Amino acid sequence: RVEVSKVLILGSGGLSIGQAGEFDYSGSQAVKAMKEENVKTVLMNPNIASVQTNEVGLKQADTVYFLPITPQFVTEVIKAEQPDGLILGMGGQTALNCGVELFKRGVLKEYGVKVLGTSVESIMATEDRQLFSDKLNEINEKIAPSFAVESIEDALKAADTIGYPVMIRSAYALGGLGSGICPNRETLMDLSTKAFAMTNQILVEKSVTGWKEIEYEVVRDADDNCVTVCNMENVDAMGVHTGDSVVVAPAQTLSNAEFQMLRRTSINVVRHLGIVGECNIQFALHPTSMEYCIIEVNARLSRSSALASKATGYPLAFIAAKIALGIPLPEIKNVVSGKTSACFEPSLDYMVTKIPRWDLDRFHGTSSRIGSSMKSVGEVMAIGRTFEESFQKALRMCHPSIEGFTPRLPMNKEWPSNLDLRKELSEPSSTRIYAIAKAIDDNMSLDEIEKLTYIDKWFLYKMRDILNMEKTLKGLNSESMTEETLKRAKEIGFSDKQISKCLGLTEAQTRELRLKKNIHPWVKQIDTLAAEYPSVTNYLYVTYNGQEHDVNFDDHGMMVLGCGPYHIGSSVEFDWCAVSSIRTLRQLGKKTVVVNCNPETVSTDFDECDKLYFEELSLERILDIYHQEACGGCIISVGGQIPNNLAVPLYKNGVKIMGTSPLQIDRAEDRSIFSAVLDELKVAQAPWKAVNTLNEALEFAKSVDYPCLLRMNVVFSEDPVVLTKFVEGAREVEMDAVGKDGRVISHAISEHVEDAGVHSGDATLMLPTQTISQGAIEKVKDATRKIAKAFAISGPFNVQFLVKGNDVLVIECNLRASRSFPFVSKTLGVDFIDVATKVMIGENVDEKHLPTLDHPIIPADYVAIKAPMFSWPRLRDADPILRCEMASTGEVACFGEGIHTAFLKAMLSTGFKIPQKGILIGIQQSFRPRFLGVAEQLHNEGFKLFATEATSDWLNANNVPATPVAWPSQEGQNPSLSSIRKLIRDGSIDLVINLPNNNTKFVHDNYVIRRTAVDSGIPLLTNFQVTKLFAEAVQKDSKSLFHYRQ
Amino acid sequence: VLDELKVAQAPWKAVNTLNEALEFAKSVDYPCLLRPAMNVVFSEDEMKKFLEEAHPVVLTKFVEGAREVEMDAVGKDGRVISHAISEHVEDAGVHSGDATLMLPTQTISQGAIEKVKDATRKIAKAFAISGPFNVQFLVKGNDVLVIECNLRASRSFPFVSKTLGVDFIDVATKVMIGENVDEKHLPTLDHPIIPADYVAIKAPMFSWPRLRDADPILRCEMASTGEVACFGEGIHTAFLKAMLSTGFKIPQKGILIGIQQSFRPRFLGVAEQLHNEGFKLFATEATSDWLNANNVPATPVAWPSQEGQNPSLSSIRKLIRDGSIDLVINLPNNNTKFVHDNYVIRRTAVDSGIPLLTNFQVTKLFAEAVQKSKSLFHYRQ
Ligand SMILES: Nc1ncnc2c1ncn2[C@@H]1O[C@H](COP(=O)(O)OP(=O)(O)O)[C@@H](O)[C@H]1O
Ligand SMILES: Nc1ncnc2c1ncn2[C@@H]1O[C@H](COP(=O)(O)OP(=O)(O)O)[C@@H](O)[C@H]1O
Ligand SMILES: Nc1ncnc2c1ncn2[C@@H]1O[C@H](COP(=O)(O)OP(=O)(O)O)[C@@H](O)[C@H]1O
Ligand SMILES: CC(=O)N[C@@H](CCC(=O)O)C(=O)O
Ligand SMILES: CC(=O)N[C@@H](CCC(=O)O)C(=O)O
Ligand SMILES: [Cl-]
Ligand SMILES: [Cl-]
Ligand SMILES: [K+]
Ligand SMILES: [K+]
Ligand SMILES: [K+]
Ligand SMILES: [K+]
Ligand SMILES: [K+]
Ligand SMILES: [K+]
Ligand SMILES: [Mg+2]
Ligand SMILES: [Mg+2]
Ligand SMILES: [Mg+2]
Ligand SMILES: [Mg+2]
């Protein structure tokens, strides 16, 4: 047993595509393990929305630093905290790369900090693709023909030796960053160039596109006991990243010989690699032989370990962390069985399906095709006891518009008239599942579909079974459908909505019809051992394929609904809110029932509540569960949009909703009612109107002046739909609050850096406010007092405001927790959700020390700043520019004595890197009056300035020196001018400032400049306010919230 | 006392030598205030030549680019039971009494207000205040520094009292003679009174025409001879009414602009704005080139010291007399090169009876406010 008294754990930082909440979940389990063994813990994670970073409970570190996960800052923390252990395996690639850099530099050795678990040597051997190859060649393991190279010239050579097509995949990365299939020389040139901006080594590898992709989660302790805890079969074949793949567990199409060969190879490889803890391993398996290739091992917790932990009920991260302290597997309890050890390989008597969630329509430049580089923003997991059951649930979980497996597209989009169905099947995309449905419907053979998609035909048989049931049901009605048929339809995952559309009924009618035949689902436990030993816990799912329930229904607990899959605009903040509520209920001795389907969340960790249903967040299924438990009530206000949109339907189906009435939530989401209420209260708002005609539109827009918002999209010229006056030059303010009986008993006001026009979630937030008049604050407060009263609010809510001097206008009101609730709560040292939860269930509340409207809590000695995270490099060709639709994928927050410090810390936490070289400046003409001073300031700080044609003339005319550069569209047409690509490549330029607006003339050229920066991996600033503040802040530490709160 | 209370203030020191002076000014950076006639200096040389004309001298770090805030308050047994915070339009450097005051504050961070308040709580207690007092603050972001404290009623007590509808002196007088006081409806530190539906602006009055040959320009020593105040739904309206109340007359014709080079980055937008409102712009040599180089049309004019030496350029006296120019904007600073010429421009406006703006912040706010009959009692309803 390793002796350690204080451990530092690293988080992932802000969430980004491929590096999501799985590490909040993992790292929380790690801290719990550490505490059980009396080990003091320090956490570094700038992701303020993470549950990890909370102060209270058995999973909370003793000390929390909201700082960049970079060697500079981790060093400062080490110095100050003098830890003797380091966990670097539970923060994705961020934490891994940071820890390897520290190691390489000898910082760990210098301060006596032991890496707990898998060594940096084992890590390097799995992250460096060449070292990996060397290791497997030592044991004559099987890999594909490949060469690890460090230049574009060497990659070309490797590809000619191997033969096209080839896959390139980066070292020291995850989620397929910089990766891609290359059918030819030119594709290889394009991609390797882009890959080298983000890594120093790529592997050029013979293609095994189409082989089956099989994963194992492997555990190995310090006694050399080594087991495979889970195995997953990817439904989409090799070539679609595991993360963007449909995946099933356990495997369905392997023989014992295949499954055991790969299992034993996993164990050998993991052993040889010196791994201690957990890891993930990937194989390519030939579809019609025993031939296989080992692709990669991830010597760290992963999105695959999170998934496996939920699928199996085996908590891999918890176990990993105990193992990192030298405790062997036989000495660690299986917490689910309560009577056995963690030395085993679970047995599942059910099948789970994970499907990804994409959000791509908003990024016009990025295709919906998927491949080796992840593009999904979330995932779901469904459990069933038939593939079909598991599979249709999982499809419904991805997005409310999806009904199951149908030949219809999501978002109610029609198929294009120029559809090439074969192309869709052969070229994976975010919508290929529905294209398969369509093809099966249109009588393409299953054999040809397997041939084009590479999806194993077995899975296709199941899909055909589903569509045959749809045909059968369509020919029936409420009188003609038998009990035998309904039962079967449910047993293969048909919802009542899907059935209703076949039968010619409403969903309610169909629910009634079903219950009238006493056809209902059954509640079953995940016990890890397929019933060999009974479960002491209640980790539950629901299935039509059983004849009994595995538990009683005597608790009558309080239901809390979770967030569903993360997607853009809906992230881990909504797991924070939900978990805060779950913990508050527990702390008050109330029985809890949780329903959520997101494998990455701490809300779907069974140790947080009395009953966890890992289930659909549908009306159908919530009703099933509520009525089966006879829950005392349901909280629908702490999991974002999904639960909130069920408020009225639930109300109407006998569900007791806690807090603010669903009647009030309806009133408030009704733009006309809401607006009329505001008029009554004398609360101002932007002029708006609903119209059906172009002439009404043009008349209204003329009557209030352009620009106008449109429902999202703004327009500035003449060259039903809701229209709203777009107010220019306006500040934006957030009010986050809790109501009790229509009174506000906690609140917090923050100011965006950016003017209205950048969406809340893409905005940078300052708390407390900075430039708002005191009279505006009074108006913001008075409008919030009246709104709370008008809608009898009892629970959390939020109101967004435009502010221009003393004009204060209401934009929107949301009668639920907003995404800024964690930021605000932690910053002010008050759990708004704890307060709100107590209001909603009638528990007492001392308002003396809360930030009521009458006695706000306003930090004096410090400020807090929240910055948005983006995933532009992974959204290939996307224009990295903020619209009225939101684009950020996560958030960070940092603290400082003042705004400049806090702002710099927040920005560094996003990956932004302070330029050491030249800055490129290109701005639309109208920004000149305000930008001149920003430019002088950058010049006076010593930055060499480059600029596009007109901007450079203008700077020089104002005695600010700038070197002009060429437009991309004009490279070669003037030999006096350097190309931007070349200046970036050479290292002359390491920050780009590009400020377009609606009157931008060179739209494409400026798009190319913006995208060049992203793809070269240098920072880009496209918002004037953010740019101003940056310039001010570089004009000139390692503290965090707890420092300032002292 | 402030150090004990942990309340910040500008570095300062009393000295009896030139070498102590220079050492200190070097140790905190120029510029520095000087009290031996208050006076600022920006260099080693500028100082030597001020002292060699004036027994110790107090030196204070002059904080540039800073907001200034007034706290007017009443204490009872060291607690604050009435208070009011106002922000100057002008940056610190223009004296309180020459400053234009906004109530409530407009551009101050909420954290700074909390600091202003906390410092006032501690000061009232440290000096066992029972009566009226005032504290002046520098504010720069969240740095809040105390300038001075006056243990008496300040000149902004009427403004503040009438604006908030509370006689601060009536309250203070009761405290001082031991009469009872209901604090429930007073603006205590814990429950301020902050106008939501209106703002108040106080503007200084000057008597430049009667001070023959006086340079009409604000120093650290004060020059105003009275005050007016007006009210509005917002700042622009209130500000225009206050300015009109001083005798300022909104230009109907051309505007003459001459500014020290360093104001250019900030002034560009002020100038574009005046141009977009339709004002014809005139300017001194360098300022006119610069405006035109930035596609803001201006007609150059001659320096007074050079009238006749270029027939392409009109004299300013003649453009004023002809009625082409009815507002002058002149913004000098320590680096102004044509000190006399710009003095003559400023004094020509005064003696022609046309309005003159010499402060950047006031000039900015003006330009914003011309972009487009009520009084306090209207708004208090
Ligand atoms: N040689 C190959 N031929 C075809 N596809 C491949 C090959 N190697 C990897 N892939 C695909 O690329 C994905 C990313 O590769 P991986 O080595 O797992 O990198 P990462 O660590 O970035 O996920 C794999 O899951 C798989 O779908
Ligand atoms: N009247 C307006 N003028 C200018 N910007 C606006 C206006 N209304 C909304 N916006 C911008 O659009 C964003 C989204 O508006 P909101 O009503 O919150 O939409 P959503 O339904 O996406 O929450 C706001 O956060 C704001 O920055
Ligand atoms: N440290 C400083 N930095 C910048 N300006 C200052 C500073 N101290 C004072 N001032 C300016 O000087 C003015 C007068 O200061 P004060 O000490 O109140 O002098 P008086 O004796 O004239 O009241 C203030 O109102 C402010 O505008
Ligand atoms: C970003 C932007 O709008 N740029 C300017 C170009 C100005 C320049 O020539 O530098 C445009 O009008 O396209
Ligand atoms: C007021 C002032 O300082 N003027 C500038 C000149 C401006 C001009 O020539 O246009 C000066 O240095 O005197
Ligand atoms: Cl929200
Ligand atoms: Cl006074
Ligand atoms: K796959
Ligand atoms: K790896
Ligand atoms: K993986
Ligand atoms: K797209
Ligand atoms: K039918
Ligand atoms: K001032
Ligand atoms: Mg990997
Ligand atoms: Mg991988
Ligand atoms: Mg919103
Ligand atoms: Mg004074």
Q: Which residues have C-beta within 8 Å of that of residue A978, sequence separation ≥ 6? A: A963, A965, A966, A988
Q: Which class for A225: exposed (0-12), middle (13-18), buried (19 or more C-beta within 10 A)?
A: middle
**Is residue B342 marked as binding?**
yes
Centroid of ligand 12 to alpha carbon of A499 (angstroms): 9
> Is residue B61 a contact partner of residue B333, using CB atoms and an 8 Å limit?
no
Q: Using alpha carbons only, what angle is made at residue A987 by residues A985 and A993, rounded to the nearest 5 degrees?
A: 90
d(CA A392, CA B342): 81
Residue count of chain B:
381
B342-346 long-range CB contacts below 8 Å, 24 or more apart? Answer: B342/B258, B343/B215, B344/B304, B344/B305, B345/B256, B345/B258, B345/B284, B345/B304, B345/B316, B346/B215, B346/B216, B346/B217
For residue B91, give Cα distances in angstroms to B99, B217, B229, B262: 9, 15, 20, 16
Please state, in angstroms and rounded to a whole number, the distance separating the CA atoms of residues B221 and B226. Answer: 15
Strand duo B281-283 + B254-259: pairing:
parallel
In whole angstroms, give the CA distance from residue A983 to residue B33: 47
> How many angstroms separate the CA atoms of B1 and B7, rounded?
9
Q: Is A806–B265 a contact, with Cβ atoms under 8 angstroms apart?
A: no
Pairing of strands B325-331, B254-259: parallel
> Which residues form the domain of B288?
205-371
Preceding amide of B192 cis, omega within 30: no
Q: Cα dihedral sign for A450, A455, A459, A465? A: negative
**Pick from A362, A445, A401: nearest CA to A564:** A401
Output the six-digit token pair for A35. 């505490």
Q: Which residue of B has its CA nearest to A778?
A: B196
What is the full DSSP assignment across B317-377? HHHHHTTSEEEEEEE--TT-S-HHHHHHHHHHHHHHT--EE--HHHHHHHHHHTT----HH
Kindly list the residues of chain A whose beta carbon comes within 8 Å of any beta carbon in chain B: 749, 768-775, 777-779, 782, 805-807, 854-855, 858-863, 897-900, 928-930, 932-933, 936, 954, 957-958
* Beta-carbon count within 10 A of B377 CB: 9
Q: For chain A, how many residues are written?
A: 1046
Ligand 11 centroid distance, CA of A972 (Å): 32
CA distance A174 to A582: 33
Residue A377: CB atoms within 10 Å: 27
b or e along A1020-1033 (b: 16 or more beta carbons within 10 Å of the residue's beta carbon)?
Answer: bbbbbbbbbbbbbb
| Whole-number Å distance between alpha carbons of A281 and A70 | 27
Those residues whose C-beta lies under 8 Å from the C-beta of residue A676, and which sit 6 or more positions away, are none
CATH number (domain holding residue B286):
3.40.50.1380
Q: Which 3 state secondary structure label does DSSP give A920?
A: strand
| Nearest-angstrom CA–CA distance, A221 and A238 | 30
Assign A552 to helix, strand or coil: coil
CB-based contacts of A847: which residues, under 8 Å, 6+ apart? A745
DSSP per position, A950-976: HHHHHHHHTT---EE---GGGTTS-TT
How far is the alpha carbon of A863 from chain B, nearest alpha carbon, in Å?
A: 8
Nearest CA-CA partner of B97 in B182, B218, B199: B218
Read off the tokens for A814. 């949301």
CB-based contacts of B144, cutoff 8 Å, min separation 6? B8, B112, B115, B116, B119, B137, B138
Alpha-carbon gap, residue A561 to A563, rounded angstroms: 7
Whole-angstrom Cα distance, residue B41 to residue A821?
A: 50
* Paired tokens of A141: 């393991």
| Closest among A232, A230, A269 to A249, alpha carbons compared | A232
Name the nearest CA neighbour of A73 among A55, A37, A98. Answer: A98
Kindly provide the b/e burial profile for residues A941-959, where b requires at least 16 CB atoms within 10 angstroms of the residue's own CB.
eebebbbbbbbbebbeebe
CA of A239 to the centre of ligand 10 (A): 13
Sign of CA dihedral A930, A935, A938, A939: negative
- Joined together, the tokens standing for residue A722 give 């809701």
Query: How far apart, in whole angstroms, are the C-alpha atoms of residue A955 and residue B65?
Result: 24
Interface contact B266, partner A, CB < 8 A: yes
> Kind of pairing, strands A226-234 and A212-220?
antiparallel
Q: What is the DSSP letter of A414?
A: P
A332 by Cβ neighbours in 10 Å (0-12 / 13-18 / 19+) ranks as: middle
Are A13 and A77 spatial neighbours (Cβ–Cβ below 8 Å)?
no
Q: In B142-248, which ranges are E strands?
A: 143-150, 199-205, 226-232
Measured over all CA atoms, what is the biggest interatomic distance in chain B, rounded to whole angstroms? Answer: 75
Question: What spatial distance separates the first Cα and last Cα of chain B, rounded to whole Å?
Answer: 44
Element (H, E) at A488: helix A483-491
Q: What is the DSSP string of A303-316?
A: HHHHHHHHHHS--H
- Is the four-CA dihedral A855, A857, A859, A864 of positive or negative sign? negative
DSSP A518: T
Task: Tell me the two tokens of residue A611.
Answer: 């009953």
Q: Which of A867, A940, A934, A857 is nearest to A899 (CA)?
A: A867
Closest residue by Cα to residue B67 from B34, B100, B38, B43: B100
Taking each continuous run of H as one helix and of E as one strand, the counts in chain A are 36, 38
**Ligand 5 neighbour B330 (Cβ under 6 A):** yes
**Could you tell me the CA-to-CA distances from A669 to A816, A880, A1010, B13, B349 in Å, in that order?**
11, 31, 37, 62, 59
| Torsion-angle region of A62 (φ positive above 0: left; ψ -120 to 50: alpha; else: beta) | alpha
> Which burial class, exposed, middle or buried, applies to A398 when counting CB atoms under 10 A from its CB (0-12, 13-18, 19+)?
buried
Which runs of consecutive H residues, i.e. helices, occur in A670-737? 671-681, 694-704
Report whether A397 contacts A380 (CB < 8 A): yes
- Does B113 contact A859 at a Cβ distance shorter than 8 Å? no
- The answer to whether A755 and A1025 have CB atoms below 8 angstroms apart is yes
All residues at 6 or more sequence positions from A211 whose CB lies less than 8 Å from its CB, including other chains: A237, A238, A284, A285, A286, A287, A293
Question: How many C-beta neighbours within 10 Å does residue A288 have?
Answer: 8
Q: How was this structure determined?
A: X-ray
Helix (H/G/I), strand (E/B), else coil: A217: strand
Closest alpha carbon within chain A to B190: A855
Which residues partner with B232 through β-bridges? Answer: B199
Are residues B367 and B273 in contact, defined by beta-carbon separation less than 8 angstroms?
yes
Taking the C-alpha atoms of residue A49 and residue A45, their distance in angstroms, rounded to an integer, is: 10
Q: Which residues line ligand 1 (CB under 6 A)?
A: A 144, 167, 169, 173-176, 179, 205, 207-209, 213, 238-242, 282, 295-296, 372
The three-state secondary structure class of A979 is: coil
Residue A876 C-beta-side C-alpha neighbours within 13 Å: 19
- Resolution value (Å, 1 decimal): 2.6
**Which tokens hold the place of B128?**
């066992």
What letters, b where the CB count within 10 A reaches 16 and e where it falls short, cover A786-812? bbbebbebbbbbbbbbbbbbbebbbbe
CA B50 to each of CA A24, A667, A670, B35, B42: distance values in angstroms, whole numbers, following the listed order: 65, 72, 71, 11, 11
Q: A379 pairs with which residues across the strands?
A: A356
* Nearest Cα to Cα of residue A284 among A334, A218, A233: A233
d(CA A504, CA A498) in angstroms, rounded, equals: 10
In terms of residue numbers, what domain contains A897? 874-1035
DSSP state of B136: E
Strand order across the beta sheet in which A40-44 lies: A63-65, A40-44, A6-10, A85-87, A114-115
Of the candidates B141, B194, B234, the beta carbon closest to that of A898 is on B141
Q: Are B190 and B117 in contact (CB under 8 A)?
A: no
Best probe of the B interface among A806, A854, A934, by most B CBs < 10 A, is A806
Instruction: Reduce the secondary structure of B87-110 to three states and give it as a string.
Output: EECCCECECHHHCCEEECCCCCCH
Beta-bridge partner residues of B131: B75
Q: What dihedral do alpha carbons A899, A900, A906, A910 form, nearest 10°? A: 140
Which 8-state DSSP code applies to residue B262? G
Collapsed DSSP state (helix, strand, coil) of residue A869 = strand
How many interface pairs between A and B have CB atoms less than 8 angstroms apart?
90
Is the backbone of residue A566 left (phi > 0), alpha (psi -120 to 50) or beta?
Answer: beta
The residue whose CA is least distant from atom 5 of ligand 5 is B260
With left for phi above 0 and alpha for psi between -120 and 50, is residue B318 left, alpha or beta? alpha
For chain A, the straight-line distance linking the first and the last C-alpha, in angstroms and rounded, comes to 36
- Identify the H or E element spanning A801: strand A795-804
DSSP-based three-state secondary structure for A868: strand
Bridge partner list, A234: A247
CA A297 to CA A268: how far, in whole Å?
A: 12
Q: Is there an atom of ligand 4 within 6 Å of A1004 CB?
A: no
Q: Are A27 and A300 in contact (CB under 8 A)?
A: no
